[PDB]
């Protein structure tokens, strides 16, 4: 079975006059849609966070923090500025065997609340992509979430390939200090 084909970059807008400094810091994964992700409601994906640290050389050190089994997991990698502002490629791709390309395109952001970012990669000659909806908080509006579904569908993704990860406290919010909620 083949994957839904990756859309042409023509269908994927680029945030105009992208501001690398304002994009920095922590984002939560509020939505995640892609040709290799399947929504599964019995044991749903938990929310994770991705921290973008802008380096002197204007690359990002990008650190994803996830809760997996009963430990914190990480994916640390470098996003190197690409051909246009708001585009990046994966640094040290030589160290990812079978990965022949990895492209990042910031679609839209207002920097202080939300962003949508497109990722496309090629691995053992198959084409993969996702769209991420990032929030500065763990919840976004229904409007931002329906916009994300719309955009996802415009790139060829049916609803069963669109996931809204369940908010969590462990690992991803190092300062939430959660406790039992009064009249939750
Ligand atoms: O798309 C995507 C990103 C991560 N991450 O750790 O940053 C993990 C799985 C999927």
Residue that is written with structure tokens 């044991």 in the block: 43
Distance CA 7, CA 150 (A): 14
The answer to whether 25 and 113 have CB atoms below 8 angstroms apart is: no
CA-closest residue to ligand 1 atom 1: 130
- Which method was it determined by? X-ray
What distance in Å separates the CA atoms of residue 43 and residue 139, rounded to the nearest whole number? 20
Residue among 27, 17, 21 at smallest CA distance from 134: 27
CA–centroid distance, 76 to ligand 1, in Å, is 10
Maximum alpha-carbon separation in the chain: 53
Q: Ligand 1: distance of its center to the CA of 63 in Å?
A: 10
Q: How many folded domains does the chain comprise?
A: 1
Nearest CA to ligand 1 atom 4: 64
Whole-Å CA distances, 99 to 95, 131, 155? 9, 19, 22
Q: Which of 101, 61, 99 is nearest to 80 (CA)?
A: 61
Strands 162-163 and 60-68, bridge-based pairing: unpaired
- Return contacts of 90-97, CB within 8 angstroms, 24+ apart: 90/121, 91/59
CATH of the domain at 76: 2.40.128.20
The residue to mutate among 66, 68, 78, 96, having the most atoms of ligand 1 within 8 angstroms of its beta carbon, is 66
Domain that holds residue 154: 1-184
Q: What is the dihedral of CA 66, 68, 72, 78, to 10 degrees?
A: -40
**Tokens encoding 3:** 């994957």
Written in H, E and C, the secondary structure of 104-173 is EEEEEECCCCEEEEEEEEEECCEEEEEEEEEECCCCCCHHHHHHHHHHHHHCCCCHHHEECCECCCCCCC
Ligand 1 centroid to 50 CA: how many Å?
8
Among the atoms of ligand 1, which is closest to the Cα of residue 119?
Answer: 1
Task: Determine the Cα–Cα distance for residues 110 and 108; give it in Å rounded to an integer.
Answer: 7
Report how far apart, in Å, the C-alpha atoms of 125 and of each of 3, 100, 120, 121 are. Answer: 12, 8, 13, 10
**117 and 98 Cβ atoms separated by less than 8 Å:** no
Q: Which of 50, 48, 26, 27 is nearest to 37 (CA)?
A: 48
β-partners of residue 122 are: 101, 127
Using the structure block, give the residue that is written with the tokens 């690992």.
171
Spell out the SS3 assignment of 31-91: EEEECCCCCCCCCCCECCEEEEEECCCCCEEEEEEEEECCEEEEEEEEEEECCCCCEEEEC
């Amino acid at each position: 079975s083949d994957l839904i084909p990756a859309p042409p970059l023509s269908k994927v807008p680029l945030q105009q006059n992208f501001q690398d400094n304002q994009f920095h810091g922590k984002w939560y994964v509020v939505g995640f849609a892609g040709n290799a992700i399947l929504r599964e409601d019995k044991d749903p994906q938990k929310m994770f966070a991705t921290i973008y640290e802008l380096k002197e050389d204007k690359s990002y050190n990008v650190t994803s923090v996830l809760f997996r089994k009963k430990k914190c997991d990480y994916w640390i990698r470098t996003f190197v500025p690409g051909s246009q502002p708001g585009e990046f490629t994966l640094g040290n791709i030589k160290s990812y065997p079978g990965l022949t390309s990895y492209l990042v395109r910031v679609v839209s952001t207002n920097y202080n609340q939300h962003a949508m970012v497109f990722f496309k990669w090629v691995s053992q000659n198959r084409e993969y992509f996702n769209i991420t909806l990032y929030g500065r908080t763990k919840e976004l509006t229904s409007e931002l979430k329906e916009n994300f579904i719309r955009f996802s569908k415009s790139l060829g993704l049916p609803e069963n390939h669109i996931v809204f990860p369940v908010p969590i406290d462990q690992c991803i919010d190092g300062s939430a200090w959660s406790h039992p909620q009064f009249e939750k």
